[PDB]
Amino acid sequence: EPVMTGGPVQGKALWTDYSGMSKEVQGPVSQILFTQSPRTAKGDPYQNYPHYIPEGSRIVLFDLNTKELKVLTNDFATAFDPCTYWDGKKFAFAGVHKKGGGCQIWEMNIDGSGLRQMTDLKGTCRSPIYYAAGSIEEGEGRIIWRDREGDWKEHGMVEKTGMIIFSGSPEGVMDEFHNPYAYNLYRLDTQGGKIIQRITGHVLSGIEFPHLNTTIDQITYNLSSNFDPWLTPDGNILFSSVQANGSRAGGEGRVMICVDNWDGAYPRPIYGNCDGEIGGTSGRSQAKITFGDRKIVYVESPYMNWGVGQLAAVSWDAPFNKTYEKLTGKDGGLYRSPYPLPDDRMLVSYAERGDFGIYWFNFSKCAAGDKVYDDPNWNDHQPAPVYVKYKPRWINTFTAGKNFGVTVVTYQPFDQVKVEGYPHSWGTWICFDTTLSDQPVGPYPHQKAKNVSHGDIKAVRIIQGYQCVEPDSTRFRVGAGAHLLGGERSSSNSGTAFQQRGIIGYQYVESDGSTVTSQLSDVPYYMQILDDKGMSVQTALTWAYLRPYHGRICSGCHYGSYRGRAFKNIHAKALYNWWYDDRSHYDSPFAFRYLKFDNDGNYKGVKHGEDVVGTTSQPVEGLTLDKQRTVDFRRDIQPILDAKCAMCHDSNNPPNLGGGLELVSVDGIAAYSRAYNSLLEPQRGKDPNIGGKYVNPSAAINSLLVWRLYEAELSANAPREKIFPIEGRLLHNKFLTQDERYAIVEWIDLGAQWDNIPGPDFYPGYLV
Amino acid sequence: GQPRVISTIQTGATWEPLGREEPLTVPEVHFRVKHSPFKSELVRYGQFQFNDAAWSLQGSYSCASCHYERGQTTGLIWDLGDEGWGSWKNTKYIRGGRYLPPFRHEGFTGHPDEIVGATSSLDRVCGRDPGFVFRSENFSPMRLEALICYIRALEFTGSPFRNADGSLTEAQKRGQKIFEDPKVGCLECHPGDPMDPRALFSDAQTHDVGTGRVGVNGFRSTPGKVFNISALEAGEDPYGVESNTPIIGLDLVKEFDTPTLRDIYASGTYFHDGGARTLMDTINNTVNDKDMHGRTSHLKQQELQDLVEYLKAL
Amino acid sequence: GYIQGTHVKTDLPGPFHITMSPDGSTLFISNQSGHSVTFVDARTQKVTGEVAVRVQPEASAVTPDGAFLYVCNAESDSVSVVDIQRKQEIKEIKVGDWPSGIKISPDGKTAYVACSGCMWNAIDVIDTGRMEKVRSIYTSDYGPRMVEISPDGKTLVAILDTVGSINRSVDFIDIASGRVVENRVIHESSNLRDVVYTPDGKYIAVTHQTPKNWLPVCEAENGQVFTNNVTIIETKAGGKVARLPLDDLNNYDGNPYGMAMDPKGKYLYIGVRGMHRVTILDMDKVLGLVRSSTQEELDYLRDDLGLVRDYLVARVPTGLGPSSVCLSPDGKFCYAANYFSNNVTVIRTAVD
Ligand code: HEC
């Protein structure tokens, strides 16, 4: 049936219509695959979602007709997350074998034979899906490339099985909630790199598993967990992303439904991450799309880390509040793992009181319909019906994976590091208007501290996030800053919700507000627009990432160009600063290490660093990871405070900056010094997420301290009711040089941390 | 009630387009250097693939959004990513495309690839568009071949501006020998005769006419300089968003493949980047270097207008 | 017959256009590749004949009495006068380059023909009694695609689709005077395929596309390259020009072409050629949005990709390439002409 578009005949659909062809190619459903889990906190750890390893679980095949069940996973200690292939005669899943090896990705024929291990990794693997790239039709494709100034010729052939997109986490890492997992999406070559070689002309770059004849590449660099990938009608990857960055979303963070390319080239929000939207802090997981009415249907859990909850829906074509629905939808129980069929039916895992089972869903009664199968001794979830899946269109990839780009001219793969000689993978990005935003003027860091027009934004600060890794358990403590702004998300490293970060670098902005820059690739980052004093007016709280050689465009600053609105037509100066040279990949300037000012401390220009090292016409700077600069309170700030501040600031004259780097015990926890505890102290009647008395994390321009150091009204947001005292006033603007003052500014804009050097170091800190 | 389809009236014979089959890889697209033997049975399928927006990602647009459905052009000027950013390209007039290879605009100079510039086949033009323009799934061999068949089957419309008698006018003939004047020298790069049906009015070569857009510091510099003199003293905003045509640009090459003068009346916004807004601007030495395109400097307004009228007759 | 712009032969009619008699008993289909016009009885829905005209007709118009059919032959650079009862072409009048459309005056005394040639700006007037071209009305710019006559009959609009232009306008003509009173520019527009009037004559609708030309070509998302739009212009002096989106975020209507206005002006029908479907909109919600919004707010709302769902009635599956649509006088049925499928889709509307 025609869905998105009309077909060749009345009542039939064009091959370009994914939903319609899915309707026509489905066929009758007889057998279904689903996961049976032991009923225990350890047997069904849905409270630890996205990190889910239902130890003792099995995957089973059930016949809707003969009603006889068979366990295919008996050789596995744990198995879950089944996903069927296109033909439906084989399926991929996640689990750990009895022989060991950890939780990995496997695939097996649905008759129970032909088992294969797709992943050997240090970490945990989850929720594999098949993405067919270069494979629409069953058979062998040919591999062709250019001869290194020769012609294009054929070398060999490859069986086309397509690729596998899955979500996985490394070993011994912490997310922004200090949970011991960080999940991200990976693409997997089933043929051992030669599928990518068929598409690109070079094998997949990434981690190779030669024993399994597979190769993996990380397509999503978010510091928090990205989980539960699925397929969009237009051939992209639909999944759930955790945006925890800093103090955003009331210091909580949100789980958003979003899409990205299978190489991770173009991540964009679908629903749930933006203010004014529905669901608040509710967890959003296991999202899938209906074929008939085209509606994204997801599990909305009352708790962010929960995998069970209600069922809600939003239109795929128009993901906005107007199309939001709560599917179930009242009494009395819990729902999980919905699976919309092309015939418009749906399979849900429902628990009336306490125990889940497979049930047909009833859209008229807005609840679970007739029962399929329930064992009382098992929790029955993740229904995966057996039918024919229509392959969504595969999008061209300009990256061969790690360090590897593919030129837009000759379309040949190249290694930016091993060959071209660059210290690290480097992409570019461009914003046509940095002053253009949908956000109002407000105290919160993601909003504007003041009104800014073209010319008011001089430059931009680019910040790289650092993963939280603490091998030594004695030198790290979570909740050390509980009395400070950070609250529960604080730690030994920071008294705020902001984890460890560093400065990628500064880039100038054109008079029309446009800016373009070259920077590191395959690393989490975000940016801040700066005024003529070099302070952040507005902060982008999220983790951006660039694949090698990839550019990324945006119309404005959270303008809606990547969310709810069409690109604004803009003729920008930065466009001509991007690539003008025949001999270059990108002619755009790399991020500068410093900023230089005038006498009074106003913005003068950008200043090169010592990190400067023929495929680009500009000096290559900031690609060396070891040389990346950050601002550490102990190494940088505290000495300045000791020299020029702690003199006349003592217990009698608040804030108390004295005591040096000596730790102070608060609630039985020794983490920071006196000055840090004093400056990070909260204020009555002020949202800690906005800031404290003297410090607003990720806003220097809103901070009382900076207000006093410049002795002026910096923003439209007053830190308190009485700022400058009437009598006994002393001007602080002459106490520091521009370097020290702007060092404090940088420290605050970075999130005002304590330990910015990842892992245990020689500098003072928590010890037990 | 709710709108629905009750019935379909079939006036003519039933026709269905080509299937999806197996999409080509980009190397497979580059693997086709030269045209396949022409097939006139595939032309309609190619027309469909040309006008279809459903094959694209979300259905935003089709080939017909640029090259029209007449198989001519919309005159829209775009910035493509393979030739560099800030380098603008006037949308190509696709009538009578097969008669003058190589394709696109940029010629052999600076293009050893023969893909972006000096394109060897029409296959390398349209075949790449799914991944380099539409950002959608690549074409199958059959659909691509059919598309190219449709493109090659496009013929010139002919100029409306000549007498119903078939002859030329006195103004057009007045301009004809200004055109063919050995010192003006249009015939050099544009050889042809008005009433000769097979005249392509192009040498199919790569020349420097001084239309190369450079930076303020010269070639391979940034930012661009205004190449439009009349617009420059007019006080037009270089980065202005309301202009039909860019008055600035940065080109990766100084030389270009010469287009046909046939149906030049129907190309809006001439040259490569769309620098020339009218035919007159391809002459008066405004948007190009002095006497680098023909020698027109000695000519005065009446002769120039006659020359324009003769151009309209092609 | 020949495929347009080619010397290659085809046996398929390839309908480019459709219209209906004022009594609603007959459908007249212009066959581009068939070089003829198909007659269809609306009641029995089957073909009652095929009338040979000059080569590649792209358009047709029926006299108020319905005794004649004026067909636009594009490549012949002419207009064929056909007897409807006799099923025979009784004359050929010749006009400026590429007529893409023709419309008969309310009194039926005059026919206006839009000459769409790229370098050609003309509207040729034709007396029905003389059955011949009288004079030519020169527009403000090149390539008028289509015209439309007011219910008043005293005003004539022409959509100017101008190659190599980002700003494309609409000309207002005073029929009694016979020249341009005003020219209203649609900004950032291209490919205007149609113009229609509201029954009260207070508004006009124009289907087109909004390119972003000044931006890099990078992705297909959020209409970075092309968005598809319908524009409502208030015929009032100094009236608003409202550019409205036809698109969802992930769903776009490729190349909107034909338009049919509900007799009471309740609904708007838009042929979508690229996506092969008929988009039906609620005109009271659209005009309601126009009246209650300022120019600034509308200009901002043009890029709203969730806005359509407010005024969007339906999107109906059609054959391939529905380049034109028309309505029955009762407005209860909408016919869509499909070029590639060589057929006509019949739609039951919301009107009951
Ligand atoms: C080193 C550069 C510093 C920093 C970072 C601060 N001080 Fe001072 N301070 C002094 C006096 C007499 C006052 C009260 C009178 C007045 O505020 O004008 C202050 C006040 C402050 C504040 C404001 C605290 C509040 O309003 O709650 C802050 C944030 C602050 N200081 C920080 C005196 C001196 C002084 C000479 C005795 C020196 C040297 C410094 N201060 C240095 C610093």
Ligand code: HEC
């Ligand atoms: C060789 C040096 C040439 C001479 C002598 C003439 N022309 Fe030309 N023509 C030439 C080139 C290399 C180009 C394209 C340049 C670019 O930047 O794209 C052209 C183009 C034209 C055009 C426009 C064609 C189009 O836009 O598709 C016209 C109308 C034209 N030329 C006419 C013309 C006249 C009138 C000449 C005598 C004064 C003449 N040409 C000479 C190459 C050369």
Ligand code: HEC
């Ligand atoms: C001004 C600072 C900018 C600029 C120049 C860009 N972005 Fe966007 N960004 C910005 C804000 C205020 C937010 C929301 C912060 C919050 O706490 O809610 C974001 C967020 C994103 C996201 C997450 C999804 C969403 O919120 O819509 C993505 C994805 C994203 N930003 C991408 C992005 C791109 C591609 C840009 C072009 C260079 C870009 N940002 C620029 C503020 C700003």
Ligand code: HEC
């Ligand atoms: C098939 C198909 C074609 N088009 Fe394309 N087109 C566009 C531009 C800006 C240019 C010029 C680029 C340059 O000069 O570097 C072209 C060029 C062509 C040509 C060459 C004709 C010739 O005589 O050399 C052909 C045959 C062609 N194109 C075919 C602009 C666009 C578009 C706007 C973004 C789009 C949508 C488009 N072209 C689409 C297509 C085709 C559909 C796959």
Ligand SMILES: [Ca+2]
């Ligand atoms: Ca159960």
Ligand SMILES: [Ca+2]
């Ligand atoms: Ca540390």
Ligand SMILES: [Ca+2]
């Ligand atoms: Ca370009």
Ligand SMILES: [Ca+2]
């Ligand atoms: Ca050529």
Ligand SMILES: [Ca+2]
């Ligand atoms: Ca042109």
Ligand SMILES: [Ca+2]
């Ligand atoms: Ca003509």
Ligand SMILES: [Cl-]
């Ligand atoms: Cl934006």
Ligand SMILES: [Mg+2]
């Ligand atoms: Mg993309």
Ligand SMILES: [Xe]
């Ligand atoms: Xe960002």
Ligand SMILES: [Xe]
């Ligand atoms: Xe549809």
Ligand SMILES: [Zn+2]
């Ligand atoms: Zn947002």
